[PDB]
Design an enzyme around this catalytic site. Structure first.
Site, PDB file in Angstrom:
ATOM      1  N   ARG A  82     -15.570 117.044 -28.228  1.00  0.00           N
ATOM      2  CA  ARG A  82     -15.854 117.937 -29.331  1.00  0.00           C
ATOM      3  C   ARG A  82     -17.274 118.453 -29.200  1.00  0.00           C
ATOM      4  NH1 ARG A  82     -15.128 118.219 -35.013  1.00  0.00           N
ATOM      5  NH2 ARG A  82     -16.191 120.178 -35.570  1.00  0.00           N
ATOM      6  N   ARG A  92      -9.386 121.185 -32.176  1.00  0.00           N
ATOM      7  CA  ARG A  92     -10.432 120.239 -31.790  1.00  0.00           C
ATOM      8  C   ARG A  92      -9.806 118.907 -31.414  1.00  0.00           C
ATOM      9  NH1 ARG A  92     -13.213 121.832 -36.944  1.00  0.00           N
ATOM     10  NH2 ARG A  92     -14.203 122.955 -35.178  1.00  0.00           N
ATOM     11  N   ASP A  95     -12.420 115.235 -35.030  1.00  0.00           N
ATOM     12  CA  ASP A  95     -13.277 115.537 -36.169  1.00  0.00           C
ATOM     13  C   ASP A  95     -13.413 114.238 -36.970  1.00  0.00           C
ATOM     14  OD1 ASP A  95     -14.821 117.314 -37.849  1.00  0.00           O
ATOM     15  OD2 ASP A  95     -13.100 117.259 -39.291  1.00  0.00           O
ATOM     16  N   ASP A  97     -15.269 112.916 -40.206  1.00  0.00           N
ATOM     17  CA  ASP A  97     -16.018 113.351 -41.396  1.00  0.00           C
ATOM     18  C   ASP A  97     -16.243 112.140 -42.288  1.00  0.00           C
ATOM     19  OD1 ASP A  97     -15.787 115.912 -40.353  1.00  0.00           O
ATOM     20  OD2 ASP A  97     -14.306 116.587 -41.887  1.00  0.00           O
TER      21      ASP A  97
HETATM   22  N1  LIG Z   1     -19.969 114.005 -44.754  1.00  0.00           N
HETATM   23  C1  LIG Z   1     -20.181 114.601 -43.571  1.00  0.00           C
HETATM   24  N2  LIG Z   1     -19.522 114.148 -42.492  1.00  0.00           N
HETATM   25  C2  LIG Z   1     -19.722 114.739 -41.282  1.00  0.00           C
HETATM   26  N3  LIG Z   1     -20.519 115.751 -41.009  1.00  0.00           N
HETATM   27  C3  LIG Z   1     -21.198 116.222 -42.102  1.00  0.00           C
HETATM   28  C4  LIG Z   1     -21.036 115.674 -43.315  1.00  0.00           C
HETATM   29  N4  LIG Z   1     -21.831 116.317 -44.293  1.00  0.00           N
HETATM   30  C5  LIG Z   1     -22.470 117.275 -43.574  1.00  0.00           C
HETATM   31  N5  LIG Z   1     -22.098 117.230 -42.249  1.00  0.00           N
HETATM   32  C6  LIG Z   1     -22.545 118.135 -41.234  1.00  0.00           C
HETATM   33  O1  LIG Z   1     -21.441 118.995 -40.833  1.00  0.00           O
HETATM   34  C7  LIG Z   1     -21.930 119.587 -39.648  1.00  0.00           C
HETATM   35  C8  LIG Z   1     -20.632 120.419 -39.069  1.00  0.00           C
HETATM   36  O2  LIG Z   1     -19.636 119.479 -38.761  1.00  0.00           O
HETATM   37  P1  LIG Z   1     -18.192 120.069 -38.452  1.00  0.00           P
HETATM   38  O3  LIG Z   1     -17.398 118.905 -37.993  1.00  0.00           O
HETATM   39  O4  LIG Z   1     -18.309 121.225 -37.513  1.00  0.00           O
HETATM   40  C9  LIG Z   1     -17.546 120.627 -40.075  1.00  0.00           C
HETATM   41  P2  LIG Z   1     -15.774 120.452 -40.128  1.00  0.00           P
HETATM   42  O5  LIG Z   1     -15.394 118.968 -40.171  1.00  0.00           O
HETATM   43  O6  LIG Z   1     -15.207 121.277 -39.040  1.00  0.00           O
HETATM   44  O7  LIG Z   1     -15.401 121.116 -41.556  1.00  0.00           O
HETATM   45  P3  LIG Z   1     -15.125 120.331 -42.915  1.00  0.00           P
HETATM   46  O8  LIG Z   1     -16.419 119.634 -43.280  1.00  0.00           O
HETATM   47  O9  LIG Z   1     -14.785 121.474 -43.878  1.00  0.00           O
HETATM   48  O10 LIG Z   1     -13.958 119.417 -42.686  1.00  0.00           O
HETATM   49  C10 LIG Z   1     -22.438 118.456 -38.861  1.00  0.00           C
HETATM   50  O11 LIG Z   1     -23.374 118.931 -37.860  1.00  0.00           O
HETATM   51  C11 LIG Z   1     -23.020 117.523 -39.941  1.00  0.00           C
HETATM   52  O12 LIG Z   1     -24.511 117.584 -39.895  1.00  0.00           O
HETATM   53  N1  LIG Z   2      -4.463 119.784 -41.542  1.00  0.00           N
HETATM   54  C1  LIG Z   2      -5.693 119.923 -41.391  1.00  0.00           C
HETATM   55  N2  LIG Z   2      -6.406 121.000 -41.376  1.00  0.00           N
HETATM   56  C2  LIG Z   2      -7.722 121.043 -41.207  1.00  0.00           C
HETATM   57  N3  LIG Z   2      -8.440 122.159 -41.193  1.00  0.00           N
HETATM   58  C3  LIG Z   2      -9.727 122.230 -41.031  1.00  0.00           C
HETATM   59  C4  LIG Z   2     -10.480 121.008 -40.844  1.00  0.00           C
HETATM   60  C5  LIG Z   2     -11.999 121.090 -40.651  1.00  0.00           C
HETATM   61  O1  LIG Z   2     -12.492 119.911 -40.201  1.00  0.00           O
HETATM   62  N4  LIG Z   2      -9.838 119.839 -40.844  1.00  0.00           N
HETATM   63  C6  LIG Z   2      -8.506 119.805 -41.015  1.00  0.00           C
HETATM   64  C7  LIG Z   2      -7.787 118.643 -41.025  1.00  0.00           C
HETATM   65  O2  LIG Z   2      -8.324 117.518 -40.873  1.00  0.00           O
HETATM   66  N5  LIG Z   2      -6.437 118.683 -41.204  1.00  0.00           N
HETATM   67 CL   LIG Z   3     -14.901 121.754 -29.674  1.00  0.00          CL
HETATM   68 MG   LIG Z   4     -13.576 118.276 -41.059  1.00  0.00          MG
HETATM   69 MG   LIG Z   5     -16.408 117.451 -39.158  1.00  0.00          MG
END
Ligand SMILES: Nc1ncnc2c1ncn2[C@@H]1O[C@H](COP(=O)(O)CP(=O)(O)OP(=O)(O)O)[C@@H](O)[C@H]1O
Ligand SMILES: Nc1nc2ncc(CO)nc2c(=O)[nH]1
Ligand SMILES: [Cl-]
Ligand SMILES: [Mg+2]
Ligand SMILES: [Mg+2]
Ligand SMILES: [Cl-]
Ligand SMILES: [Mg+2]
EC number: 2.7.6.3
Length: 158
Positions: A82, A92, A95, A97
């Protein structure tokens, strides 16, 4: 502290990616996994133009500080291919989070905890409810209550 981490994958064999991530999460210093949800098959948010996700959640007991845990989760993502961060999402490999970190409320450049959108996402809330059914959010809301007062539909197992 118990950190609750959401796992998602929709590229390069999501089941292998999630199992690899679980192994790596358990190997983070000063940490061990407590519980793992079932694996759920979920349609991607938004642009339908990508594969279904595997979504799960884990509880991680850790004595790391929140940003230290973040560093490790980001390194696990990278080791699993990633590379795109804070961009529009395409498929991806992984992920990770951070949904909750203890009862902490964090609003920094790097970290927003509770996750900003988790209360709107069944693919985050149902796996969390499976491992932490009595969970209370920092603002005093119960997870069970959030899932029922708004008729979130049930997910399909992977
Ligand atoms: N609770 C959290 N967990 C993980 N990353 C976090 C976070 N809060 C803020 N961030 C920040 O989010 C930035 C982008 O991470 P990404 O993984 O690209 C977002 P995503 O998971 O694609 O979207 P989403 O947050 O809507 O699910 C990271 O560089 C991190 O600094
Ligand atoms: N179903 C599904 N959709 C998503 N879309 C965006 C993102 C951004 O991280 N995550 C997810 C996910 O975990 N599950
Ligand atoms: Cl990627
Ligand atoms: Mg996410
Ligand atoms: Mg993320
Ligand atoms: Cl909250
Ligand atoms: Mg360990």
């Amino acid at each position: 502290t118990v950190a609750y981490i959401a796992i998602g994958s929709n590229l390069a064999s999501p089941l292998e990616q999630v199992n690899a991530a679980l192994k790596a999460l358990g190997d983070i210093p000063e940490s061990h996994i407590l519980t793992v949800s079932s694996f759920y098959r979920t349609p991607p948010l938004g642009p339908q133009d990508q594969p279904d996700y595997l979504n799960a959640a884990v509880a991680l007991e850790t004595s790391l500080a929140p940003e230290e845990l973040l560093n490790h989760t980001q390194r696990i993502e990278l080791q699993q291919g990633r590379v795109r961060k804070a961009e529009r999402a395409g498929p991806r490999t992984l992920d990770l989070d951070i949904m909750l970190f203890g009862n902490e409320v964090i609003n920094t450049e790097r970290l927003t905890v509770p996750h900003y959108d988790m209360k709107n996402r069944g693919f985050m809330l149902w796996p969390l409810f499976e491992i932490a059914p009595e969970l209370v959010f920092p603002d005093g809301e119960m997870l069970r209550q959030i899932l029922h007062t708004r008729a979130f539909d049930k997910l399909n197992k992977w």
